[PDB]
Design a protein around this nucleic acid. Structure first.
Ligand SMILES: [Zn+2]
Lengths: 13, 242, 98
RNA sequence: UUGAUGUCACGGAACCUUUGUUGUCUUCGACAUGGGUA
């Protein structure tokens, strides 16, 4: 539920 | 319509203004009173127009929030009713409505003056039912004294409160009761206040003379105009003065 | 860039919550229900992730998921003529008569 | 906590007056659900 921010890899086009 | 009166007060009402807020309170007070009585005005089933604006104005008034001035005008309506039955009934309603305000510590003197005067006038209207003086008449005159003494403690020389105190004290004497404790002191203060050119007050100054032998008020009595309705009272007063 | 939440949008969202919870056609399995329905959310708290619609400074509508319900911004009393409403009825305006 | 040759206080009905009343058919059909694809 987003209580702790998380870093993830995102790919866009 | 009491409701139509409230609606008109809401159209032109300035809350900083005191004249408008007195009229608005009068319309609100009158509407509530007609509801308690099962009068034919209770058949009005309509409501206030412009609800969002009417609600805001009414909500500001309740946060901004006189009882004395509304009821004072209700008493002045009593004094004009011809029949004693009409006056006795309306004095009944004034006494019961103003009893709550008298209990409050922060009680306006106008509220207390109106209630004491309503007790005195109701005391005059008690019809005897026996050989004895009515016990209710004595109680009414004593209650009027008690309310006036609330005002007189704060201000020992309140003009109207002294007169109502002295009116009830005289009627206690007429009922076979003795004068109250401070009758001599309350009577002296009204003499200091001045002279009132009213028949119902001249007799108070004559009582002052008979106790203090002060001649200043006597010549004023003898100069009264003789065009009044109760001429027999004035002739008796001048004979006492002469 | 932030937008303000008026009391109107909070009331609409609180109406949305009770619609999710009181669903007679909801799936019997609480795992298949949404987070709003499963945990029985009854108010909007800090740190909640939502989708919001805003105009200029203020926000308009709030939904918990991408495709959700659009709660009406008026009571149904405002959707009929004021003359057709009950002569003695309830208060459908803004603010509380209490 | 009385005073005395003098108390009808069993000498005095908390008494009198006010409708828990008013308004409401045990009635009934359209959804529910949030993405997925690129
Ligand atoms: Zn109607």
């Amino acid at each position: 539920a987003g209580e702790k921010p998380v870093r993830m890899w995102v790919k866009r086009f | 319509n009491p409701i139509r009166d409230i609606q008109d007060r809401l159209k032109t009402a300035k809350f900083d203004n005191k004249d408008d807020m007195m009229n608005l309170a009068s319309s609100l007070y009158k509407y509530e009173k007609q509801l308690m009585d099962s009068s034919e005005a209770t058949l009005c089933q309509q409501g206030l127009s412009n609800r969002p604006n009417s609600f805001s104005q009414l909500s500001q008034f309740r946060d901004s929030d006189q009882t004395g001035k509304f009821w004072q005008n209700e008493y002045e309506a009593c004094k004009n009713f011809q029949t004693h039955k009409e006056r006795r009934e309306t004095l009944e309603q004034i006494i019961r409505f103003l009893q709550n305000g008298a209990e409050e510590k922060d009680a306006d003197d106008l509220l207390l003056k109106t209630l004491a005067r309503a007790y005195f006038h109701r005391g005059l209207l008690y019809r005897p039912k026996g050989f004895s003086v009515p016990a209710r008449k004595v109680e009414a005159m004593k209650k009027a004294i008690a309310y006036c003494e609330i005002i007189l403690d704060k201000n020992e020389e309140e003009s109207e409160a002294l007169r109502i105190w002295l009116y009830a004290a005289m009627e206690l004497r007429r009922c076979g009761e003795e004068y109250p404790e401070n009758f001599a002191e309350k009577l002296f203060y009204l003499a200091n206040d001045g002279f009132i050119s009213e028949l119902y007050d001249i007799r108070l100054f004559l009582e002052y003379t008979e106790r203090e032998e002060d001649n200043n008020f006597l010549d004023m009595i003898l100069q009264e105009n003789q065009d009044r309705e109760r001429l027999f009272e004035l002739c008796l007063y001048k004979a006492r003065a002469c | 860039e932030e937008y303000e939440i008026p009391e109107k949008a909070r009331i609409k969202y609180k109406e949305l919550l009770r619609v999710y919870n009181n669903n007679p056609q909801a799936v019997p399995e609480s795992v298949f229900q949404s987070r709003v329905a499963r945990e029985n959310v009854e108010k909007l708290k800090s740190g909640d992730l939502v989708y919001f619609k805003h105009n200029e400074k203020y926000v308009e509508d709030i939904v918990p998921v991408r495709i959700s319900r659009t709660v009406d911004d008026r009571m149904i009393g405002k959707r009929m003529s004021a003359d057709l409403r009950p002569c003695h009825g309830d208060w459908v305006e803004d603010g509380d008569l209490s």
